[PDB]
Amino acid sequence: VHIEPRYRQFPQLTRSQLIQAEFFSATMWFWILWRFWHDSDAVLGHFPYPDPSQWTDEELGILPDDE
């Protein structure tokens, strides 16, 4: 296709390039949303992080101070 140059005006665009750009942007966003829906543990994690403060001395094998 031949695109005539413009002087001080917006260039002549093509329906094909417009629809291709829109299709690929939509494809990227669909891929992002689809991947986040299925496997969101890649972003938010999969297993909880334990709190060491709640582990009892009995299960950690810590004897009484006096003993």
Partner: protein, 110 residues
């Protein structure tokens, strides 16, 4: 591998911009290309999102794991801090490229 992909595409997009603006490589003279050049715009946006680690793009599967490994290891504290600041600055310069090349009003010859 991932960087080869998206960095090659980013360089190709910048080259297309340069060729379309008569060998101009200055973002101070670029502008309006978001609607002037649709396909290069979307390609560069996708590449910059992949470069910065969009949560499920090609750069996510390497950069995110790299950052997790750096944070979770017995590393140099200064090296870890500089790596995090470098990630922030990566986002910063990707924004700079997009903002000064595609957004706004034209600054190229008539």
């Amino acid at each position: 591998c991932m960087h080869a992909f998206f960095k090659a595409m980013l360089f190709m997009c910048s080259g297309s911009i340069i060729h379309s603006l008569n060998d101009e490589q200055d973002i101070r003279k670029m502008g309006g290309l978001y609607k002037a050049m649709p396909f290069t715009t979307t390609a560069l946006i996708i590449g910059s999102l992949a470069l910065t680690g969009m949560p499920y793009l090609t750069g996510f599967y390497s950069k995110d794991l790299i950052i997790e490994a750096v944070n979770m290891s017995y590393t140099n504290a200064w090296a870890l801090l500089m790596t995090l600041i470098a990630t922030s600055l990566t986002a910063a310069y990707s924004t700079r490229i997009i903002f000064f090349a595609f957004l706004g009003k034209p600054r190229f010859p008539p």
